Symmetry: D2
Subunit: 294 residues, 4 copies
Amino acid sequence: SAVKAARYGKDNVRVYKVHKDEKTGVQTVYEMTVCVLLEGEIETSYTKADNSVIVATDSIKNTIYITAKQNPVTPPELFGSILGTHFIEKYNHIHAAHVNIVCHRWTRMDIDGKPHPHSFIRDSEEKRNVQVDVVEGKGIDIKSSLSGLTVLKSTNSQFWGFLRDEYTTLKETWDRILSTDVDATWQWKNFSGLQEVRSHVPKFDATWATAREVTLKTFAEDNSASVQATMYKMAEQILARQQLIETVEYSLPNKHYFEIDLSWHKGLQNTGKNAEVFAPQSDPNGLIKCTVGR
Amino acid sequence: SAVKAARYGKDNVRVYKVHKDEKTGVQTVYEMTVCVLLEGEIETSYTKADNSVIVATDSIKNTIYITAKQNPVTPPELFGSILGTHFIEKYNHIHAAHVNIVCHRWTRMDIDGKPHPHSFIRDSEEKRNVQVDVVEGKGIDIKSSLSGLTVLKSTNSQFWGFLRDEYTTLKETWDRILSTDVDATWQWKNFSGLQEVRSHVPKFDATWATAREVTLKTFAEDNSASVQATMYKMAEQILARQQLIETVEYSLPNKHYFEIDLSWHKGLQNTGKNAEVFAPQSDPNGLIKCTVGRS
Amino acid sequence: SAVKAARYGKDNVRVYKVHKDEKTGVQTVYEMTVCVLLEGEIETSYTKADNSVIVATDSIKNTIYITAKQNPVTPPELFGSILGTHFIEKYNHIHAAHVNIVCHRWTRMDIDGKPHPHSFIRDSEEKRNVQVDVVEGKGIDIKSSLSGLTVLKSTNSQFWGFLRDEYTTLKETWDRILSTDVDATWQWKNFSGLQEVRSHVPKFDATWATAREVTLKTFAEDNSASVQATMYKMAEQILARQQLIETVEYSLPNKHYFEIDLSWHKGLQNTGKNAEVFAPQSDPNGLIKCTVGRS
Amino acid sequence: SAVKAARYGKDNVRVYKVHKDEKTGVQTVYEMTVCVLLEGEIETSYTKADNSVIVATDSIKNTIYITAKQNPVTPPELFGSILGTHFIEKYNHIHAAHVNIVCHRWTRMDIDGKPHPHSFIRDSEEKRNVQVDVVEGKGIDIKSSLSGLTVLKSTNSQFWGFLRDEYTTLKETWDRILSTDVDATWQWKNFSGLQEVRSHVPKFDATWATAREVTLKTFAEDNSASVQATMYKMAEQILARQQLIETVEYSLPNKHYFEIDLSWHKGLQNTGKNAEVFAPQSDPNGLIKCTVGRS
Ligand SMILES: Nc1c([N+](=O)[O-])[nH]c(=O)[nH]c1=O
Ligand SMILES: Nc1c([N+](=O)[O-])[nH]c(=O)[nH]c1=O
Ligand SMILES: Nc1c([N+](=O)[O-])[nH]c(=O)[nH]c1=O
Ligand SMILES: Nc1c([N+](=O)[O-])[nH]c(=O)[nH]c1=O
C-alpha cells in the first residue's frame, strides 16, 4: 500500500477583522471562516510516523491570524492567494496549499435613513466564498462563489413537455411556484502567481456583484421553461460579462410547494387557478446542476 | 397516579399562502410554520385508551390549511386568534388552544430599482412569531416576538465596574465588540375574544415594526455600560410606545470576540488600541435576560 | 416600567473531566454542556447601569471549571446542586441559581469482547439532563430527564375510534409504524439543601436507568391504542418504582411514516396488508405531551 | 457559450422498507436517503428549453420507490447498483446514473436481554453510505463508506517532533486526548455490470464490518504518534483484508480538548500530569485526510 494523496490542515478557523478610519471614524467589519489544507512531501508522517515534515495545524491557525493582521482580508480571492502562497514559499516540502474561505454578512445598519459608523447586521445567511488552490509551478487556481441565496417566485414558472412513461405521474403545468437556494460558482482563468492576482483585484468584487445581480434578475424575469433553461441563461450572461472567468457552475435545489386539495371539505376550491394555500415540502427536492464553458 | 396536565396537537405545519391582486398583478407571499396543541377533557385517551375524545392531529393539520384558506394569515396575531378560537368553539370537550406561528421572510426583490410583482428573497433568517393562548372564558393571551435578529457593533460598548473576587480573571474594558442574537417578546393585555382582537388588528404589525426599530436603534446608539443596561432601555421605549403591551421580555445571548495576542510573533501588536484581528467564539456565551413590566 | 424579572449567566459551557484509576489503570471520561443563570438583587445593573452587583458571566464560567475540579461531576443531579448551592451561598445579593446540564455519551468501547480502558465511542445522540433550581430558603428543585432517544416499531401500533367530522380525512388503522423521539422528565420531591441531596445520590443514576428501562420496554411491548395511552402507562410504572419523584412528564413527537400507493404502476400492491416501502415524513408531526402526577 | 457538464435529479428521498418473516415473525426495518443525479443527452433542456429529454425528477422519485419495492434494499451497493443500472438501460439518452445512499441506523431493541421482533432504536448518528456511479459502457463504480463515527481516547496519543518555527507556539506532548469523527471510504475495483456486483454481494456487508472493526480497534490500540500515522495503519489492514479494494480514504477532523490552567485560583493544579478538567473546543479543528492505494 501507499499514500496516493494526503492533505492536512486546520478547518473552521473563524476570523474577524475591523477597519477603523481616522477622519470619518467609520469602522468596517469583516468576518469569515477559513480552512487551509496542505500537501507536499509528507508521506513519511503517515507511513513511518515522522512528524518532522509536519507543520502543526495549530501553526497554520497561527499563520492565518498573523496573515489577516498584516494584509487586507478583502477581497477573499486576494487574501486567499496571499495566504496560500505563503505556505508553499515559507516551506520547501510544502508544494500545494488549499484555501477555502467563507465570508459572512455584516451589513452596515441604516439608522434614521443614515448609514451607521459602527453597527452591523447579519442581513442574510447567504455567504460569499472562495476556493483558492495554490500550486508550486502551476500558479493560483481561484473559484469564487455565492451560496445560500434563497429565492422564490409565485408564478411565471412552468414545467411541461417532459418525457412521460410508466413511471410518470407528474402533471404538466403552466403556472407553478419556483423556489431554490442558489449556489453559483465562477472559476477564474489560471493566474501566474500573486502578482497577476493583485493586478485583477478590482475585478473580483465586480464579478461577484455581477453574478449576484444576474442571478436575481434572470430568476425574476425569465418565464421559466424549466430550472435547467433558467440556469444556462444565468450562466451565459456571466460568461459574456467577464473574460477572465472560464466557466460557470450552478447547483440549484428545486424546493417544491404542493397544492392542497381542500375540495373534500365543503367543496373548497384550492387547486389550479384557485390555488392559494400550499404546503411547502422539506423533502424530497430536485437537484439540478450544470457547468457552462465557452 | 393521575393526569396533571395534557396537551396534544400537530407541530411544524408548513403553510404557504399567496395573495393575487387582479388589478396590479402584484402577488404577495406568506410562509409560516404552525403548531397547534389542544387542551381539554381528554384524560381518557391517556388513562382508558379512549380515542373518541381525540381530534386527530391530522384533522388539526387540515383545519390549519382550511383556516388559512378562508381567512387572512396576517398579522399572525389575528390568524392565530381565529385558529385557536375555532377549536374551543367547534369542540365542547376542548377548552384551551395553544397556537404558535413562526413567520418566514419572503421579502420582495428589487429588480432594476423596481419592486417585482411575483419575486421574493429570504433576506434574513430572522423570524416573526406569535404565541396565542386561547382559553375558554379567559379570553385570548397573545405574546408577539421577534427572534433570529443578529447584530454586532465594533465599539461603543464597555464592561467595567463588575464585582471582582477570587473567581474573577476578566480584565475590565472601556471598549469592546458587542454582538448578540436578539430575542424580544412583547405580551399584549389579555383580550376578551376575536372581536377585541379584530378591533386592534392594525396595532400588531405596527408594534412589531416599532419593537424592531427600537431594538436596532438603541443597540446602535447606546454607549453600552452593560448588556443588562442597553436591554432595559429597549424594553422601556417599547412599553412607553404601546399602551396595550403589559410586558416586554428580552433574551440576549452575548457572543464573544476575543483579541488575539500576537506579540510572540515579531512583537506584532494586536491587543488594546492596536486590536484588529479577533477570534469569534462559538462557545460559551453569556446569556442575559429580563422581563420589564409596568409600574 | 420595572424589572418584573431578570436572570443572567453563562451558557454552552463545555466541560470534560477524566477519572484515572491508580489501581486498575482504567480511565473514565465525562462530557457535558453547562449553563448557569443567576438571580437576586440585580435590577440596578439594568436600571441604573450599576455593574457592582454583576458577577461577570466569565467568572461564572471559571466557577464551573473550578467546581468541576474539586467535586465529582456525576451524577449530574448532585454536581448541579453543588454548583447551584455555591452561588447562593457565596453571594449575598444572589438568591436563586438555575443550573442546566446536558450529559453527552462517551460509552466505553469493547475491543475483542473486553472493555477497553481508555477508549470511548459516542454511541447515541441521546442526552441525559438536569435542571436544578437552587433558591435561597426554598431548597433545591431538581428535574431529571432523558431526551433524544429515537425509537420505532414497525407494527403493534394502532389508531382508530378517534373523533371524525367534516375536518377528518384520516383513515382508521389497526396496524401502523410508530416512531418518536423520547423526551421524558421526572421531577424529584423538593430537597432542603445539599445534605439531603448527598443522602439520595444513589437514587439518581438508578431512577434514570429505570426511566430509560421502562420507556423502552413499554414502547416495545404495548399494543398501542394511542401514543397518549402508551405514554401514560410508561409514566405510571416510573412513579410506582420511585417514591421521591412527584411527577413524570413525557413529550413525544409522532414521526409519521406514510404508505405509498404504487397501484398506478403495473397494479403494484404497496398499501394495506401489502405495505413494504414507505415515505418517512420530515414534517409535519404529531406532538403529544403529558404530565402524570400522584393521586 | 456551451454546456461542459450537466446532471439533474432527485435528492433527499427518504425510504423505509420493512421485511416481515411469516415463519419467525421477526420484522426488519431499513431506512435510507437516496439521491440520484442523471447525465446524458440532455444539453437541449438547458440551451433549447426542450423538456422532451428530461425525465421529471418526480419520476426518479417514483422510480426509487418502485425499485426499492421490487428488489432487496440491502446491501446499499447492490440496490444503488440495480437503481443506477435501471436508468441507463430504460433510457437511451441517459448514459450515466450517479446514486447516493445514506443508511440510517435502526438497531433492534433488546428487551430483557431478548431481541424484540418489531422494535428498534437509532442507536447512533453513524451512517453507512454508498456512492454508485454507473456509466454506460464503463461498468459500475462503487465507493463505500462509514461516517459520523465519533470516538475519543483519554490517553495513549502524543504529538511531538513536529516542525517548529516563528509561527509555532504549540507545546509538544507525550499524553493528550484524541477524539475525532471518522469518515472512512473504501473504493471497489470497477465492476463490469449488475451481474458481477450481484456476484460479490456477500463481500459488501462484510468489508464494511471489517472497516469499522479495523478502525475501532486500531484507534483504541495504537499508541498514536500522529493522527496521520494511526490513519495509515487503518488503511493498510483494510486493503489487506480485501483484494477488491482499490483504495481507502480516511478523513479525520481532529477535535481538540484544551487544558484549563487554574493555578490562578488557590494554586489549583489542573495541567500536565494533574489535568482532570478540560475544555472541549467546537472550533477550529485539525482536519487530516489521505488516500491509500496499492503499490
Ligand atoms: N497539527 C497536528 C496536530 N496538532 O494538534 O496540531 N495533531 C496531529 O495529530 N497532527 C497534526 O498535523
Ligand atoms: N392524532 C393522533 C394520531 N394521528 O396519527 O393523528 N396518532 C396517535 O397515536 N395520537 C393522536 O392524537
Ligand atoms: N459578564 C458580563 C459580560 N462579560 O463579558 O462577562 N458582559 C456584559 O454585558 N454583562 C455581564 O454580566
Ligand atoms: N423534474 C423537474 C421539475 N419537476 O418539477 O419535476 N421541474 C423542473 O424545472 N425541472 C425538472 O427536471
